[PDB]
């Protein structure tokens, strides 16, 4: 569906062109491998990385900036919890989240309009299903 | 060119095969001192797969042997820095392994191209 596809399209370009382009951000492009960091999942409850966000976008998980940002926010919060607040990992994670937020403000009004249209479409489907 | 097709083939080994080794991502780009501060103290002749791709894009490699020297240096470097028994060195060894296998699946083509890159050098010298 048209508006949801357009909305996912934009989120995906934010991930690929901006978030993944943060210098030295490579370790956040991949899930942490529990064989090599055996305590990571003792500490981190809800893992996330940039390749998983891309997979979620391709399946239209996100109908709104808010559910996209809940997964982006985990990138920072997990790094703080596992790698520590003054770790170079965490400095890189903050940059990843900062570019995402700054990019999304450039597209504010258009993403507001696409969210409204996704919701109007959805509503039309439900009342229409009766 | 023999060189354009040769470089194409090497780049596809790096991206398709060597970068596909599981958990090989730490070898895909140069180490940053900000993450590994003693790394360039220990490793005086650094190498990574992105660097090999830039080398290929500049046609630095005229033969498999010059290409393999850089590939092998990735393993020689992991040996010194991470240690001979390190998990990272087992991956580096696997990257080295899949490079050698893929070169074989392309032997005849690469030989043709490698011969023709010389023919050009001698045409140059004969004309010089």
């Amino acid at each position: 569906d048209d508006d949801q596809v357009a909305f996912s399209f934009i989120l995906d370009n934010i991930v690929t062109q901006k978030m993944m382009a943060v210098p030295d951000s490579w370790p956040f492009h991949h899930p942490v491998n529990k064989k090599f960091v055996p305590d990571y999942y003792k500490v981190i409850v809800n893992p996330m990385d940039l390749e998983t966000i891309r997979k979620n976008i391709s399946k239209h998980k996100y109908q709104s900036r808010e559910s996209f940002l809940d997964d982006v926010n985990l990138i920072l919060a997990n790094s703080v919890k596992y790698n520590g607040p003054e770790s170079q990992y965490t400095k890189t994670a903050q940059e990843i989240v900062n570019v995402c937020y700054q990019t999304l403000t450039e597209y504010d009004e258009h993403l507001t309009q696409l969210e409204k249209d996704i919701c109007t479409a959805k509503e039309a489907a439900l009342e229409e299903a009766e | 060119d023999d060189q354009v097709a040769f470089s194409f083939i090497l780049d596809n080994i790096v991206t398709q095969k060597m970068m596909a080794v599981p958990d090989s991502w730490p070898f895909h780009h140069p180490v940053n001192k900000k993450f590994v501060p003693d790394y360039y103290k220990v490793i005086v002749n650094p190498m990574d797969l992105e660097t090999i791709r830039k080398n290929i894009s500049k046609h630095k490699y005229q033969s498999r042997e010059s290409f393999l020297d850089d590939v092998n240096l990735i393993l020689a470097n992991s040996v010194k820095y991470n240690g001979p028994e390190s998990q990272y060195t087992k991956t580096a060894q696997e990257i080295v392994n899949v490079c050698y296998q893929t070169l074989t699946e392309y032997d005849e083509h690469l030989t043709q191209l490698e011969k023709d890159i010389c023919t050009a050098k001698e045409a140059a010298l004969e004309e010089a």
Partner: peptide, 11 residues
Amino acid sequence: SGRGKGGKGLG
């Protein structure tokens, strides 16, 4: 913090 992922990301 946990035990740490080391400088290179895989321990």
